[PDB]
Amino acid sequence: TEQEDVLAKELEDVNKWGLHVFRIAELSGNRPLTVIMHTIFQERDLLKTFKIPVDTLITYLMTLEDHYHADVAYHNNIHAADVVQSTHVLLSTPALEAVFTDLEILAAIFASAIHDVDHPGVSNQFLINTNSELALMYNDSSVLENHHLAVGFKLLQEENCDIFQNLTKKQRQSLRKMVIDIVLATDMSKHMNLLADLKTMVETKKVTSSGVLLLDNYSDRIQVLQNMVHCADLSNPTKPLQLYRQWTDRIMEEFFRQGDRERERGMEISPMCDKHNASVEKSQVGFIDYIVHPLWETWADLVHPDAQDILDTLEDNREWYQSTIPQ
Amino acid sequence: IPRFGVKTEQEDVLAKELEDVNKWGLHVFRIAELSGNRPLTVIMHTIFQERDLLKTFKIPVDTLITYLMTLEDHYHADVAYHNNIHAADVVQSTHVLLSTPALEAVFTDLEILAAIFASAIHDVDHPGVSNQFLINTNSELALMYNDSSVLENHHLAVGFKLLQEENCDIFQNLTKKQRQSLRKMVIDIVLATDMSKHMNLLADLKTMVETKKVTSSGVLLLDNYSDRIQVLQNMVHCADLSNPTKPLQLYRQWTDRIMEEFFRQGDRERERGMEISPMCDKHNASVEKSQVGFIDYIVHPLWETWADLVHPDAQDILDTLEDNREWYQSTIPQ
Amino acid sequence: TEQEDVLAKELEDVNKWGLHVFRIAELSGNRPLTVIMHTIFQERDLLKTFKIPVDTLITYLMTLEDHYHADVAYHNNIHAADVVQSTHVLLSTPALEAVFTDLEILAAIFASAIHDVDHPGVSNQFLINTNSELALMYNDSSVLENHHLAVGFKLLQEENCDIFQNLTKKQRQSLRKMVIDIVLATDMSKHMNLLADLKTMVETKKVTSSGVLLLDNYSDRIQVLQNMVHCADLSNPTKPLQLYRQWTDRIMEEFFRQGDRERERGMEISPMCDKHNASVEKSQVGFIDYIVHPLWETWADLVHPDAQDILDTLEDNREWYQSTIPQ
Amino acid sequence: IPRFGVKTEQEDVLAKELEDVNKWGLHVFRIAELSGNRPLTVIMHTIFQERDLLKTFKIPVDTLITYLMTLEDHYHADVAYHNNIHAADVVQSTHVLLSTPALEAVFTDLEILAAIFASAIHDVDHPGVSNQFLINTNSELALMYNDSSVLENHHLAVGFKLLQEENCDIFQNLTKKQRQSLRKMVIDIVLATDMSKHMNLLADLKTMVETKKVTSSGVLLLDNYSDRIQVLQNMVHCADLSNPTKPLQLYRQWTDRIMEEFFRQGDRERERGMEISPMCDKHNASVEKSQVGFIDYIVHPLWETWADLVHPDAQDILDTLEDNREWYQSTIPQ
Ligand SMILES: [O-][n+]1cccc(C[C@H](c2ccc(OC(F)F)c(OC3CC3)c2)c2ncc(C(O)(C(F)(F)F)C(F)(F)F)s2)c1
Ligand SMILES: [O-][n+]1cccc(C[C@H](c2ccc(OC(F)F)c(OC3CC3)c2)c2ncc(C(O)(C(F)(F)F)C(F)(F)F)s2)c1
Ligand SMILES: [O-][n+]1cccc(C[C@H](c2ccc(OC(F)F)c(OC3CC3)c2)c2ncc(C(O)(C(F)(F)F)C(F)(F)F)s2)c1
Ligand SMILES: [O-][n+]1cccc(C[C@H](c2ccc(OC(F)F)c(OC3CC3)c2)c2ncc(C(O)(C(F)(F)F)C(F)(F)F)s2)c1
Ligand SMILES: [Mg+2]
Ligand SMILES: [Mg+2]
Ligand SMILES: [Mg+2]
Ligand SMILES: [Mg+2]
Ligand SMILES: [Zn+2]
Ligand SMILES: [Zn+2]
Ligand SMILES: [Zn+2]
Ligand SMILES: [Zn+2]
């Protein structure tokens, strides 16, 4: 338990943006998703609130984690633990204090933990082009996203894995719809139109008598939740450079692997996947310029301005990569 | 099925019925009976031969026939409305719509193949119950498709999967380019049959009619994929919603069937202590009032707009719809 | 009311070989499996014993019944209800009194209930020959049987359908193995081996202090349960002629329908499936002589003299059909 | 297009290594490195070319290579033993056994293709855990296969399913009769790889040896499908269990890998609070003693019997097995 102290201390940062997730992954014996999720649940007192037997929770978490591919560079259990922990911080954003119910909170966190489960390390288009069984089952539409959801729920059926066994029928139905709405929203093909609404919304932004954001209908409450987890999934560039660079190393490794596979198959190599003609630095700045920043700028507003330290970090990291661009 | 190389008595009657394949109002139920319950197979085959689709896409005839029978075999005979007769009707209706003057020479053979194939598979393996029923019972289908367009996704998955059975790949001779294109259009069209897409689908159709463009010929102008697929989606959607525009004799048979299917679902919901879906309670129904509402809020608005787009091609269809609307209206007991 | 009293009265014969199962099918609005299963569960006190909530039982039964095809002439919910009821009678045979446990009883009945669920009305060979998805999934081996089991168990996951939610893990563990063993044995491909082994047991027939049969190991126990359900699945010829004749009209219609489909596809028409070259009477006599009678004669030996009247009804029916053979 | 189905600049070193493809003891680990982790693709391609299977069954070369890369891609790189290297090894081992003098000209080209294909797909998509683990956790796989030869059934289903991916149908030019016969043999062979069937397989192999028949040539006489398929099943079974009969240098690497996989399952079982499977507890292991036992109760009885069937073809293989058995014996801590 010598390191049990290190892990324990490391976890003390679970509420902080910039947790040493990679260290935790090492300290936990490659169980970042299980320990982090377990801490967040204990912390938010979700086990007692939803009467979740401790053994059941841990068995499901290990099972869920086990279904993330250890051989995949980016989309693995570490990325999952990261999006969970990040959504967890984004939920505690002052501008949302006491806004969401324990169920909505449970939904956001659960959705984050399962959002990429059983990811093969290749894109939807690659699965589509090859006529993979997954693309055939989902009609080439949000192939992976649909799959992530199905697996996430199916695993609840394994031995002692149903963590929602004590929710009421109504709670289960409401939880399930939200989890689905959120995960399906992680598909980058939804990003554009998804962003517009986050804007159109921040325009009419309303506050309560408590100074916290005001959300009425399901429509508005889910959009915030959708964009929120969507931000957590696209939060690598807003973290301290040290962590961010590791994520970039990982995503590039996954990209290049796909490119090697497309190349050996005589398939057109996907954008940014050709290791023989790459622009890692230039791609990061462009990624930040046309996608991440535009998204994270709006959320910075929405939770005005508890996201400041986060937005400045994004801009700082951009400059860094910018100064790394060859020629 | 023949003898000595000549059609049998039945076959000849059937062939004579099939002569109206290019006409709105085909005696589809008569064809279903005459063909030994193979309306989808015979109608699809007639249309493929009519449009020379076998040669154009090099589809071996035995493969086409084997796939068709296999596809038809996966529609449920015990389902009153959503069966092979409904599929054959939608195929034939789409076929007629494709040949409307306002669209002559607008679509490629591939887009034509896509609209017809999508129509043929659009409701395959339909269980006779709504998406919400599948969602409420936590069915495996709903679990697989995340409660989103459960049936429509299933219809597509099954339509394509059946291509893998013995000698069923009718697209074996298409290039990967053709197949990727064909597949995307078919998927776009069938997913658009989910009623949850009706409103937006109609909105865009209206918008298009607003900015409508033609050429030296009174033929519509469609540039991008977005407008071409929009028209194809609304075309098959209209076909799927064409029952009220057919001669009253046919329209009523369809109403009897959808009502039977609705009531059957209602009885299942009642057995299960579930809330009975709208119009599915045989004990508290208003068949006539419901057909009137169906026309006033859904069918007429859709077809009216379509008639604008292909004006004046759909005039008669529109007038028939209005005649049938009045008929049902006058049937409402007070 | 009336039709309700008629149904209630008909169900009174639930413990008798020769129940008017078709009449019950009509009277219940096509719910023979639901009403007969429910009746039998009450009769054996299974709801109390395994604490099965009544709403859960009814919902599961209707769900299971709904997954049998109404358009299938023979392999539909009436056949299922019939096998369930037939197994229920065989279980009460004197020579087996107090031999099986409540769990083993439950397994045999549940197995009977789900043994042909979602049957498409065509043989394994037809499915194999057309390269169907089911055959590909099950490697052409007991395709339908494996499928009936997978569906039967899967349906327990639908809303309020888990009738074993109160069984212990050990009970679930044992019940599942027994159900699997029983249904896989319904494949006619395993008939010959089943009969042989059954006979062997008839030779090593070990009685008990109470004069009832003696079964030590799981192997002998499951063997008797497998043959029992097998006999039930093959009991049509041993039932009152009015019933038997209906069964024959149904199986023949299913056979002929497959034969037409095979004819359509240019496939070789399966044995007895060609309506243009049929011999219904002749075929039934052959079915009794080479399969049904051999099996039952043996079962009669094991439970002597418990099934004398069943055996006599068979031999009687055999003659009826024989004399029906035109010349 | 590449010489070995895979691009490589070390092509020279790789080509040299592949010269021993017909030899027991090929340096498969070296080939995996030289091929860029494509041992299965490279070895299968080499064997197919060598046995002239591409021409004999009109298998397009790009199709073969795409299928192989696809098949190989579905073996898990994170699994220490049951991965693409094990697959490549069993394929190559079966290839050698098929060429043994006592079996010359006995099997048809189709049976040869079946044995080799079966060897290639026999452990595809293996999760690194046993059937029992999948059963006790109520996995979807066990549910689908009713807890019977769960993995073996899945390996077959995936191996065949993958033929449906883009340009992956290597059997597209086989007549219907050939496909049916090939499919049956492959299924019979892979299902026989389940250890639960080992004892019965051995017993039948022994019986065959006891009534062994040879033709006018010096080769084994196999009259019926039953005897033919039995020999092929045991052949692939021996290949799957051939690690202890390979040069010690290779055998120890295989041992390190299976032990790594065993212990990982052990840690997972421990985590979940499950009883730890035999030899899976890294805290109470006896690696050396376990290998001797494995050889004494399973591997040697099997190979001793196979050696009798093909006497004296496998004499050196048996000699190696025995030498290796002694090495581990002396490695046992006293
Ligand atoms: O598939 N997927 C879904 C959600 C999130 C991610 C993260 C994934 C991702 C994550 C971290 C990251 O770098 C860093 F943050 F670690 C990335 O760098 C690259 C060059 C865009 C990319 C992508 N987001 C958008 C991607 C696109 O390829 C493009 F770059 F925008 F073009 C896509 F949008 F898909 F077209 S890929 C990947
Ligand atoms: O499931 N589905 C998809 C596409 C088309 C159809 C035809 C289906 C249909 C077809 C023929 C028909 O009557 C006649 F034309 F046969 C119908 O009568 C009823 C009362 C609407 C309904 C429906 N269209 C819209 C339906 C709705 O339930 C409602 F009535 F409009 F509310 C829905 F829109 F779904 F809410 S159901 C059914
Ligand atoms: O699929 N299946 C599994 C178990 C039991 C049944 C009942 C099924 C059955 C049931 C009732 C019946 O008649 C009557 F009892 F209703 C039957 O008539 C025929 C000609 C044998 C057949 C069969 N049992 C054995 C059948 C065989 O075709 C043969 F006759 F033995 F050759 C088979 F064994 F399959 F080869 S088919 C059907
Ligand atoms: O799952 N599976 C199927 C076929 C072949 C293998 C190879 C697998 C195998 C392969 C190489 C090997 O060692 C070496 F050759 F690499 C092994 O070491 C161990 C302790 C038996 C085991 C097994 N064969 C039999 C195994 C058993 O656990 C037991 F040892 F016999 F008890 C089993 F039979 F399963 F009970 S596991 C594994
Ligand atoms: Mg994702
Ligand atoms: Mg539909
Ligand atoms: Mg059966
Ligand atoms: Mg194996
Ligand atoms: Zn993600
Ligand atoms: Zn429809
Ligand atoms: Zn049966
Ligand atoms: Zn193996």
Side-chain angles (χ1 to χ4, degrees), chain B residues 5 8 23 27-29 37 42 45 59 123 137 148 162 168 171 175 181 241 249 260 272 278 309 321 325:
Chain B
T8 63
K23 300 175 185 175
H27 298 173
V28 72
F29 293 103
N37 192 47
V42 305
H45 182 48
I59 312 173
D123 280 327
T137 52
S148 313
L162 290 175
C168 288
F171 307 124
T175 67
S181 174
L241 297 180
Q249 184 221 64
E260 190 189 317
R272 295 156 173 269
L309 188 62
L321 173 64
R325 191 286 188 177

Side-chain angles (χ1 to χ4, degrees), chain A residues 299-318:
Chain A
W299 184 270
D301 280 313
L302 204 64
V303 302
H304 195 306
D306 198 63
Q308 198 50 59
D309 309 304
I310 298 177
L311 210 189
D312 297 317
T313 301
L314 178 62
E315 296 163 356
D316 285 332
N317 293 320
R318 175 196 183 295

Side-chain angles (χ1 to χ4, degrees), chain B residues 36 38 65-66 69-70 73-74 76-78 133 136-140 143 161 164-168 264 268 271-272, chain C residues 29-31 58-59 62-63 66-67 69-71 126 129-133 136 154 157-159 161 257 261 264-265:
Chain B
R38 282 224 172 292
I65 297 303
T66 302
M69 293 189 300
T70 300
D73 280 354
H74 285 72
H76 308 195
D78 59 307
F133 185 93
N136 292 347
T137 52
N138 284 347
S139 68
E140 190 185 19
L143 174 56
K161 178 58 179 172
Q164 307 176 320
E165 300 210 335
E166 187 64 33
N167 193 204
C168 288
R264 177 52 173 183
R268 296 179 63 189
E271 298 177 289
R272 295 156 173 269
Chain C
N30 195 38
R31 278 268 170 250
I58 295 176
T59 301
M62 295 181 159
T63 297
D66 285 354
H67 284 72
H69 305 198
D71 67 308
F126 178 94
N129 290 351
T130 56
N131 298 354
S132 64
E133 180 174 43
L136 191 160
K154 271 182 174 182
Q157 308 186 305
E158 280 193 30
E159 187 56 40
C161 287
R257 186 182 186 178
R261 295 181 66 180
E264 295 190 298
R265 300 155 177 271

Side-chain angles (χ1 to χ4, degrees), chain C residues 75 79 115-117 119 144-145 148 183 186-188 233:
Chain C
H75 292 99
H79 165 66
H115 97 278
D116 278 326
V117 64
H119 197 300
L144 287 173
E145 294 73 24
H148 302 314
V183 178
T186 54
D187 187 326
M188 286 301 290
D233 195 37

Side-chain angles (χ1 to χ4, degrees), chain D residues 97-111:
Chain D
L97 290 178
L98 279 168
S99 301
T100 205
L103 292 170
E104 180 178 349
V106 172
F107 295 109
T108 69
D109 289 323
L110 189 65
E111 302 173 313

Side-chain angles (χ1 to χ4, degrees), chain A residues 163-187:
Chain A
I163 54 171
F164 306 131
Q165 63 188 72
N166 290 320
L167 264 71
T168 67
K169 182 184 182 185
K170 179 64 176 185
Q171 293 182 309
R172 279 188 292 107
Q173 295 179 172
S174 204
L175 172 69
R176 181 179 167 68
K177 180 172 181 63
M178 295 190 282
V179 171
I180 290 171
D181 282 345
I182 298 171
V183 176
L184 285 179
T186 62
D187 186 321

Side-chain angles (χ1 to χ4, degrees), chain D residues 260-277:
Chain D
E260 186 181 326
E261 193 173 306
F262 271 26
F263 297 155
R264 188 179 179 182
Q265 179 172 318
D267 297 342
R268 293 182 66 185
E269 299 178 314
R270 190 177 303 110
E271 287 188 304
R272 295 150 171 278
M274 306 170 92
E275 169 186 294
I276 300 179
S277 299

Side-chain angles (χ1 to χ4, degrees), chain C residues 74-75 79 115-116 119 123 144-145 186-189 191 230 233-237 244 246-252 255 271-272 283-284 287 291-292:
Chain C
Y74 183 95
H75 292 99
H79 165 66
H115 97 278
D116 278 326
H119 197 300
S123 71
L144 287 173
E145 294 73 24
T186 54
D187 187 326
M188 286 301 290
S189 67
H191 173 74
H230 181 46
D233 195 37
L234 296 179
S235 68
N236 292 172
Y244 178 26
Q246 301 183 63
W247 287 127
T248 300
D249 289 317
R250 286 170 175 283
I251 194 64
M252 288 304 97
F255 274 19
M272 306 173 277
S283 297
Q284 279 309 299
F287 181 44
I291 295 176
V292 181

